[PDB]
UniProtKB/Swiss-Prot annotation:
Is a negative regulator of Notch target genes expression, required for RBPJ-mediated transcriptional repression. It recruits KDM1A to Notch-responsive elements and promotes KDM1A-mediated H3K4me demethylation. Involved in the regulation of ubiquitin-dependent degradation of a set of methylated non-histone proteins, including SOX2, DNMT1 and E2F1. It acts as an adapter recruiting the CRL4-DCAF5 E3 ubiquitin ligase complex to methylated target proteins. Required for normal maturation of myeloid progenitor cells. It comes from Homo sapiens. It comes from the Eukaryota. It is found in: Nucleus. This is Lethal(3)malignant brain tumor-like protein 3. MBT repeats lie at residues 8-82. Interacts with RNF2. Interacts (via SAM domain) with SAMD1 (via SAM domain); the interaction mediates L3MBTL3 binding to chromatin. Interacts with RBPJ; the interaction is required for L3MBTL3 localization to chromatin and is impaired by Notch-derived peptides containing the intracellular domain (NICD). Interacts (via SAM domain) with KDM1A. Interacts with DCAF5. Interacts with DNMT1. Interacts with E2F1. Interacts with SOX2. Interacts with SFMBT1.
């Protein structure tokens, strides 16, 4: 492709498959990383890396709570890391025996 030209303007100013610091609705004093899954007319589905998709919610891209990647420095507020690299591992069925990890020693 890449044959021609196509210029347009953004609806709010956000993109998909990107990162952004979102303020936990339930906790306005806590912020974590997010991932723009889908950008609506005037909204954007912010998905918290790890946190069960269910958590995901449609937040206004123009919302004052929404902050760009690096808003922790601007204001100087501490950022909290997302879920563990094992908490997002779903549909993991392990069908096999295991060995006991216990057995002290004394005499």
């Amino acid at each position: 492709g890449s044959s021609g030209s196509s210029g347009v303007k953004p609806p709010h100013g956000f993109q998909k498959k990107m990162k952004l610091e979102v303020v936990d609705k339930r906790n306005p004093m806590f912020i974590r990383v997010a991932t723009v899954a889908d950008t609506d007319d005037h909204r954007v589905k912010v998905h918290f890396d790890g946190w069960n998709n269910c958590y995901d919610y449609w937040i206004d891209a123009d919302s004052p709570d929404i902050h760009p990647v690096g808003w922790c420095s601007k204001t100087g507020h501490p950022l909290q890391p997302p879920l563990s690299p094992l908490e997002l591992m779903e549909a993991s069925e392990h069908g096999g025996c295991s060995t006991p990890g216990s057995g002290p020693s004394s005499g």
